Amino acid sequence: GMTEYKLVVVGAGGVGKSALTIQLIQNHFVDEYDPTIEDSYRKQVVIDGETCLLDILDTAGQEEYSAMRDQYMRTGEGFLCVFAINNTKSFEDIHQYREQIKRVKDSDDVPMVLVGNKCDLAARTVESRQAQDLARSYGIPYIETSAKTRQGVEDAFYTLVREIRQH
Amino acid sequence: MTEYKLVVVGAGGVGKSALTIQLIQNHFVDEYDPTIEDSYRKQVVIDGETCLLDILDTAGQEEASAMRDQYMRTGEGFLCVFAINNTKSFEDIHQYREQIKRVKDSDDVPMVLVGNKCDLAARTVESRQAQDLARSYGIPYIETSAKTRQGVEDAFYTLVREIRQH
Amino acid sequence: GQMRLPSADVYRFAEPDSEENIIFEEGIPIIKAGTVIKLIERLTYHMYADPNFVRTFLTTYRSFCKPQELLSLIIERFEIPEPEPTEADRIAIENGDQPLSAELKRFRKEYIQPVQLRVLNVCRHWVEHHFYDFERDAYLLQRMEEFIGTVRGKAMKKWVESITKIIQRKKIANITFQSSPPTVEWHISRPGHIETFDLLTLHPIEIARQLTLLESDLYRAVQPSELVGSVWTKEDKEINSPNLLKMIRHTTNLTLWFEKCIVETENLEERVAVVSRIIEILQVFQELNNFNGVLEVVSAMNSSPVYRLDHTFEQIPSRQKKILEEAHELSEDHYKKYLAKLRSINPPCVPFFGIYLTNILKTEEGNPEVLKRHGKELINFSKRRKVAEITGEIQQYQNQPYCLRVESDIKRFFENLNPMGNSMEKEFTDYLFNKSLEIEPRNPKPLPRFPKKYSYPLKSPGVRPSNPR
Ligand SMILES: Nc1nc2c(ncn2[C@@H]2O[C@H](COP(=O)(O)OP(=O)(O)NP(=O)(O)O)[C@@H](O)[C@H]2O)c(=O)[nH]1
Ligand SMILES: NS(=O)(=O)c1ccc(Oc2ccc(F)c(Cl)c2)cc1
Ligand SMILES: [Mg+2]
Numbered sequence: 001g002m003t004e005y006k007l008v009v010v011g012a013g014g015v016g017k018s019a020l021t022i023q024l025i026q027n028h029f030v031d032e033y034d035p036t037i038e039d040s041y042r043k044q045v046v047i048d049g050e051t052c053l054l055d056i057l058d059t060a061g062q063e064e065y066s067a068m069r070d071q072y073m074r075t076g077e078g079f080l081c082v083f084a085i086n087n088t089k090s091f092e093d094i095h096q097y098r099e100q101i102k103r104v105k106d107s108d109d110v111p112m113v114l115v116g117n118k119c120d121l122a123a124r125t126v127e128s129r130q131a132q133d134l135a136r137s138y139g140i141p142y143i144e145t146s147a148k149t150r151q152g153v154e155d156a157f158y159t160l161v162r163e164i165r166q167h
Numbered sequence: 168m169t170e171y172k173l174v175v176v177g178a179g180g181v182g183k184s185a186l187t188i189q190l191i192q193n194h195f196v197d198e199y200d201p202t203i204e205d206s207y208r209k210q211v212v213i214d215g216e217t218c219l220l221d222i223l224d225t226a227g228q229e230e231a232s233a234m235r236d237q238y239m240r241t242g243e244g245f246l247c248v249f250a251i252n253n254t255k256s257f258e259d260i261h262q263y264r265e266q267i268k269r270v271k272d273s274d275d276v277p278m279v280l281v282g283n284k285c286d287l288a289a290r291t292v293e294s295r296q297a298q299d300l301a302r303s304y305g306i307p308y309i310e311t312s313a314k315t316r317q318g319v320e321d322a323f324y325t326l327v328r329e330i331r332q333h
Numbered sequence: 334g335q336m337r338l339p340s341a342d343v344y345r346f347a348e349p350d351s352e353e354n355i356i357f358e359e360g361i362p363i364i365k366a367g368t369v370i371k372l373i374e375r376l377t378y379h380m381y382a383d384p385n386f387v388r389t390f391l392t393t394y395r396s397f398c399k400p401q402e403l404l405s406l407i408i409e410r411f412e413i414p415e416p417e418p419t420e421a422d423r424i425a426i427e428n429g430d431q432p433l434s435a436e437l438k439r440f441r442k443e444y445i446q447p448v449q450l451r452v453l454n455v456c457r458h459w460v461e462h463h464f465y466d467f468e469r470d471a472y473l474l475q476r477m478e479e480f481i482g483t484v485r486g487k488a489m490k491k492w493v494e495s496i497t498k499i500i501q502r503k504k505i506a507n508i509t510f511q512s513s514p515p516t517v518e519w520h521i522s523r524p525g526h527i528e529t530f531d532l533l534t535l536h537p538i539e540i541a542r543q544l545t546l547l548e549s550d551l552y553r554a555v556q557p558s559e560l561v562g563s564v565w566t567k568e569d570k571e572i573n574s575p576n577l578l579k580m581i582r583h584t585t586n587l588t589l590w591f592e593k594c595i596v597e598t599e600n601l602e603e604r605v606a607v608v609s610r611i612i613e614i615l616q617v618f619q620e621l622n623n624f625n626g627v628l629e630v631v632s633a634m635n636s637s638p639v640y641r642l643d644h645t646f647e648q649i650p651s652r653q654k655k656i657l658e659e660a661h662e663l664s665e666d667h668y669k670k671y672l673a674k675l676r677s678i679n680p681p682c683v684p685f686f687g688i689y690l691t692n693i694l695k696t697e698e699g700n701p702e703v704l705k706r707h708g709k710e711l712i713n714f715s716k717r718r719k720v721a722e723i724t725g726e727i728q729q730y731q732n733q734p735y736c737l738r739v740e741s742d743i744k745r746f747f748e749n750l751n752p753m754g755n756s757m758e759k760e761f762t763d764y765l766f767n768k769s770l771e772i773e774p775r776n777p778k779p780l781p782r783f784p785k786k787y788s789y790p791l792k793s794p795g796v797r798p799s800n801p802r
């Protein structure tokens with residue numbers, strides 16, 4: 001039947017990374033969530049007229065289990081590398097996440113998108129030009145998202161699926 | 168996993184809490200801290216079937232005697248505990264038995280009669296007297312020690328079997 | 334008829350329920366949302382006890398009420414006014430007779446005494462199971478001591494005196510089995526010869542047992558205070574979640590040690606023996622229901638340095654390939670088979686904590702703190718109940734102890750394991766990957782040969798236990 005895409009969310013902890021998948025999978029219009037519910041991370045969507053199933057792995061909260069990252073990452077066909085726009089360290093971490101994905105997938109060309117997440121009203125410290133320049137140096141798209149208004153969320157995941165389809 | 172709601176009842180000081188904590192934690196409580204109401208959960212395989220025991224540990228002190236209907240309504244099975252060195256606690260058993268039957272409006276409530284503190288030599292309730300009472304209720308009688316663990320699993324898991332076959 | 338209540342002007346907890354102050358879920362009611370006053374009323378309700386609610390509330394309330402304010406509110410709840418004499422009582426008194434005081438006696442028996450006892454049960458649970466509030470705020474403890482120590486009247490006396498003693502014991506603060514633990518097993522390393530301890534020289538049964546005791550102790554030490562509010566992910570995580578972080582860092586260190594043992598064994602035959610021994614340890618972890626240990630091994634075998642070692646994998650016996658594959662299947666499909674297995678076994682067990690962390694974090698992040706209804710902000714209690722269901726599951730598996738004997742020297746060996754040495758994480762994991770490339774180069778580079786490094790026999794003693802008389 002329909003294609004299933006296994007997507008993996010990676011990035012620094014403690015800076016609102018989990019809001020990206022929660023806002024996608026959510027009842028978009030009721031702010032509520034039970035992550036324990038079988039298939040609270042599966043969503044059927046239509047992208048460019050083609051229906052598919054997204055299976056999203058987001059191990060948010062397990063960042064200290066650093067030796068599990070390889071196993072978790074190998075499950076993915078495409079990756080969202082997420083940093084917080086008010087946390088410069090999370091942005092500086094992106095390079096090593098990308099290198100680790102390339103190693104785990106044994107490929108220099110792994111479908112991935114760079115996502116800058118606005119997780120609160122604290123002052124932005126990573127300007128969009130800095131993140132665009134980083135994404136361009138890697139040859140990947142850059143999407144900015146809000147953790148509160150759902151802006152950018154669909155664009156982040158749909159752009160990643162397009163990267164997979166066009167690989 | 169089937170869930171079973173067990174309730175431990177009986178006079179103050181007979182060892183309801185000590186029995187429950189021995190089952191849950193494998194630890195014997197030396198202190199006598201009178202209970203108001205405590206609850207515990209235990210996942211355990213009994214006769215090859217996994218279940219989840221919810222155990223309500225109730226107040227034996229007479230000052231709480233007007234607050235029992237609410238927990239007797241929710242319980243599926245009752246451990247009726249007395250201490251074998253305390254004849255008054257044995258005489259108190261029938262009051263719990265009769266109240267449980269009234270609240271649940273049933274002559275057929277899963278129950279086990281438990282004679283606790285069987286590690287103590289100075290017994291004042293003979294096994295035969297308690298066994299006669301248990302037979303009149305149609306229920307098993309199990310002597311236990313929360314201190315040594317003698318009979319503790321048998322008492323609780325027999326009650327589970329009674330609920331299962333109810 | 335129902336008992337009459339004090340005027341809500343003198344006693345705030347007698348205000349009628351309305352959708353402006355409490356919302357129930359669709360046989361005691363389950364609360365979806367409410368004001369803090371209504372939550373405390375139902376926490377201490379005169380009609381029924383709710384021990385699960387007491388645990389849920391005391392685990393999670395700090396997200397909506399400060400400890401000092403909670404104590405003030407439950408003291409306010411405790412201080413219930415008694416009703417005035419009724420007309421029948423008045424007429425009796427006017428005739429010099431003793432009044433029956435039927436309504437007063439009923440209100441004492443059916444409202445005051447149950448509510449007051451349930452307030453004391455909140456205090457008792459607070460001190461016994463959430464004492465960190467008092468460790469962190471000495472003045473809160475003074476207030477609790479004063480409140481309990483000045484409750485008058487005989488109906489509460491037994492519990493007041495008991496709670497006073499419990500508090501004093503908590504300020505200055507043993508396992509029984511019917512079966513004996515099995516005998517400690519030894520292989521090449523003999524008792525007391527800690528300098529020879531290593532992956533292949535300790536007995537694999539005893540490696541798994543001692544790691545299970547260690548990992549069980551680490552699991553059992555994690556308190557809900559380290560989890561609520563997602564505090565293990567925040568800037569003060571080392572202050573607020575030290576036992577959880579110690580547990581995770583042990584798991585990480587053991588995984589890295591397994592990887593290091595594998596890739597630093599350059600001889601192919603010896604490396605097969607190393608991997609085979611680690612899968613035997615995994616088999617004993619499975620037998621012990623040590624799921625943390627199972628996943629420590631699975632994580633190591635799926636790490637980038639190990640996973641690519643096809644020449645090693647090819648020589649692993651088929652039955653061990655199957656053991657590893659079935660263990661890995663526990664994690665597939667978002668841990669579907671792990672979750673089913675955890676819920677089926679007979680404890681003791683050591684759960685994998687990471688799933689709980691992700692579920693607590695996403696429950697906190699994915700639900701609002703408040704619900705807005707009729708212009709009022711109500712505390713979203715359903716969200717807190719979901720968090721406390723997870724912390725309750727954690728606690729249920731913390732109760733059962735393992736019937737295994739500690740070996741102090743083997744315990745110390747694994748406590749002091751430090752595969753990274755003084756290296757930083759990236760430097761070390763790059764080192765492991767470069768060793769992997771050295772010992773099994775990428776095709777089409779030829780496979781080199783390497784000298785043996787172990788002077789002792791590689792044959793495993795196996796993982797079935799022995800029993801001399
Ligand atoms: N020797 C011995 N002492 C026991 C045993 N069970 C309980 N005790 C002791 O008896 C005392 C009362 O035990 P406890 O469990 O608090 O009794 P309870 O029935 O729960 N009391 P309450 O109804 O007030 O909550 C404690 O000192 C406890 O150590 C037993 O099997 N053997
Ligand atoms: N997904 S998994 O857990 O089934 C799995 C993990 C690692 C695998 O690669 C190995 C490499 C070297 C070895 F010595 C061995 Cl045993 C295995 C193969 C499968
Ligand atoms: Mg008790």
Ligand code: NA
Pocket residue numbers: 086087088089125
């Ligand atoms: Na910053």
